[PDB]
Amino acid sequence: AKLTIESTPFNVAEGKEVLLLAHNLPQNRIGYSWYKGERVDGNSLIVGYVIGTQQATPGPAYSGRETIYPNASLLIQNVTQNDTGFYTLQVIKSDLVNEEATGQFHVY
């Protein structure tokens, strides 16, 4: 089934939090990478996560506000007006036939 991302809530007050959820995770997943923007881009990588070891490693775009959970959910806290826009998840699979999906939220 097709990986999709949903922000809850979509519309977020500045200084509050958003949770980005993934639906239809693939069965053979081994880990995750979250990105700022609409495209998988290593300079825009917020955090990587290995399921088996439960290790999160910040990427270049990490800002001290993002936490990734084992089901791929991403919490971003202390959102600012500059955060409005798109976010992209990759689910890394054991055969490296990886999947990705993009979602968005809005800060007011």
β-pair partners for 101 = 89
Scan residues 12-51 and list those touching Zn ion (CB under 5 A): 14, 24, 26, 41, 43
* Coil vs helix vs strand at 42: helix
Interatomic CA distance for residues 19 and 102, integer angstroms:
14
Least Å from the CB of residue 15 to a copy of itself: 28
Q: How far is the CB of 6 from a copy of itself (least distance, A)?
A: 18
Adjacent-strand bridge partners of 4:
23
CB atoms within 10 A of CB 65: 14
Interacting residues with a copy of itself between 32 and 91 (CB under 8 A): 32-33, 39-42, 45, 48-50, 55, 57-59, 90
Cβ-based nearer residue to a copy of itself, 32 or 87: 32
> The tokens of 85 are what?
């826009």
Residue with tokens 């979602």: 103
**Footprint on this chain of a copy of itself (rule: CB under 8 A):** 3, 31-33, 39-42, 45, 48-50, 55, 57-59, 90, 92-100
